[PDB]
Design a protein around this ligand. Structure first.
Ligand SMILES: [Cl-]
Ligand SMILES: [Cl-]
Ligand SMILES: [Cl-]
Ligand SMILES: [Cl-]
Ligand SMILES: [Cl-]
Ligand SMILES: [Cl-]
Lengths: 226, 213
């Protein structure tokens, strides 16, 4: 019955402004202080700000003090977070969190919202490059060979990677993306196959990046190397 | 303001183990500490409040103890549903979280299979050279990957990515990607990936010669 309902993925430019919200129900909203807690990609939980039940007192982490404003509407049970002067390092999931107890002090959270990803970046939508990672003597360990596709320079996430339109799945590894210094993402998807049948089996990686309506089919062929 | 430190940062446990996670505060917080559990793609879940008060619906398996600057979350006998990250959080002053402790699936040592990929000619036509070194199906996570070009140790021109533990075999896979410009890639001959892992009797080096590859 206690629900905290949040917004969705949003893109903003560094220096930009964004207002994130959380609609609450199933409890006396005005009695509870509320917080925003963020999580940067692959990082731990970071408390951002809090606001008392009535809104007379607001608290902020030093990292956001003069840039973020917490507020609430106790008429329509809504929590807000105005984020001005945004920076790349504010890229994170933002969760609304209701205090466990009605007390004035001791902010710890019994219910959480599903989170809202806020991405701060001066990058434009771009489809990936798809290069083959060719099997060879140097990517062969006895009876097994490795091959793959390097899915590079794309923005924003996600990108999906299938092999042989879904027919190939055992031994597949699509690595998590890494953000490059350029502000574009890159990942590689690899697969282990029998090296004995490299000259006979065909391997195609099917790369799809919905933001830029990109759907690439790249045949991965062997190279002598040695 | 109040720094919370968790030890260990990663806890390799097997099902049925008695698991202990400690939280150390920079100053006394009396007993105003909470513990949360978080799995990937999910919001945290409150387990314990006021250092030892177990949240409703939380299994009896989980228990909390401590006060002042030392607190401990204990799981009596680990279950499959307990592999996750656990965070401590103080609320004596403005709230702060600890860094988190990942409870991960312990399995037996598995040496990595090392593979190396030269840059394709198509990428070289675009002006960039990406050299990919794959360490496949290994355990534990700890591994050292060094890039050498004409026996010159490289630093800061490669970034790595690791998969989450495999559903079937609980192993990890890792990719190390060295990136250069094509102009710079063409100035060197030998490209080597040296892998140091506790499952390998000695370091494995996968290398190629630019020209032959
Ligand atoms: Cl109040
Ligand atoms: Cl007030
Ligand atoms: Cl550790
Ligand atoms: Cl997470
Ligand atoms: Cl239990
Ligand atoms: Cl924090």
């Amino acid at each position: 019955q206690v629900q905290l309902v949040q917004s969705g993925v949003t893109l903003v430019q560094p220096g930009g402004s964004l207002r994130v919200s959380c609609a609450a129900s199933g409890f006396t909203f005005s009695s509870y202080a509320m917080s925003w807690v963020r999580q940067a990609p692959g990082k731990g939980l970071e408390w951002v700000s809090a606001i008392s039940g009535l809104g007379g007192s607001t608290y902020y982490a030093d990292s956001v003090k003069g840039r973020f404003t917490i507020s609430r509407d106790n008429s329509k049970n809504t929590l807000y977070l105005q984020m001005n002067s945004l920076r790349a390092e504010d890229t994170a999931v933002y969760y609304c969190a209701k205090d466990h107890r009605v007390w004035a002090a001791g902010y710890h959270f019994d219910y959480w919202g599903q989170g809202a990803l806020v991405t701060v970046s001066s990058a434009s939508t771009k489809g990936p490059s798809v290069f083959p990672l060719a099997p060879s003597s140097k990517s062969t360990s006895g009876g097994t060979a490795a091959l793959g596709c390097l899915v590079k320079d794309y923005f924003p996430e996600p990108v999906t990677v299938s092999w042989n339109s879904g027919a190939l799945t055992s031994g597949v590894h699509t690595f998590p993306a890494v953000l490059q210094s350029s502000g574009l993402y890159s990942l590689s998807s690899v697969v282990t196959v029998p090296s004995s049948s490299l000259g006979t089996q065909t391997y195609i990686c099917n790369v799809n990046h919905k933001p830029s309506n990109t759907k690439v089919d790249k045949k991965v062929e062997p190279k002598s190397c040695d | 303001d109040i720094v919370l430190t968790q030890s260990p940062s990663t806890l390799s446990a097997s099902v049925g183990d008695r698991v202990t996670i400690t939280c150390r505060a920079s100053q006394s917080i009396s007993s105003w500490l909470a513990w949360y559990q978080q799995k990937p793609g999910e919001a945290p879940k409150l387990l314990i409040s006021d250092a030892s008060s177990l949240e409703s619906g939380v299994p009896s398996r989980f228990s909390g103890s401590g006060s002042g600057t030392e607190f401990t979350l204990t799981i009596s006998s680990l279950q499959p549903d307990d592999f996750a990250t656990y965070y401590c959080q103080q609320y004596y002053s403005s709230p702060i979280f600890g860094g988190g402790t990942k409870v991960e699936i312990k399995r037996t040592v598995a040496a990595p299979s090392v593979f190396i990929f030269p840059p394709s000619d198509e990428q070289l036509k675009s002006g960039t050279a990406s050299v990919v070194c794959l360490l496949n199906n290994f355990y534990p996570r700890e591994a050292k990957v060094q890039w050498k070009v004409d026996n010159a140790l490289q630093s800061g021109n490669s970034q790595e990515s690791v998969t989450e533990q495999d559903s079937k075999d609980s192993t990890y896979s890792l990719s190390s990607t060295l990136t250069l410009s094509k102009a710079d890639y063409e100035k060197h001959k030998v490209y080597a990936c040296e892998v140091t892992h506790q499952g390998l009797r000695s370091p494995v080096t996968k290398s190629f010669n630019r020209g032959e590859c």
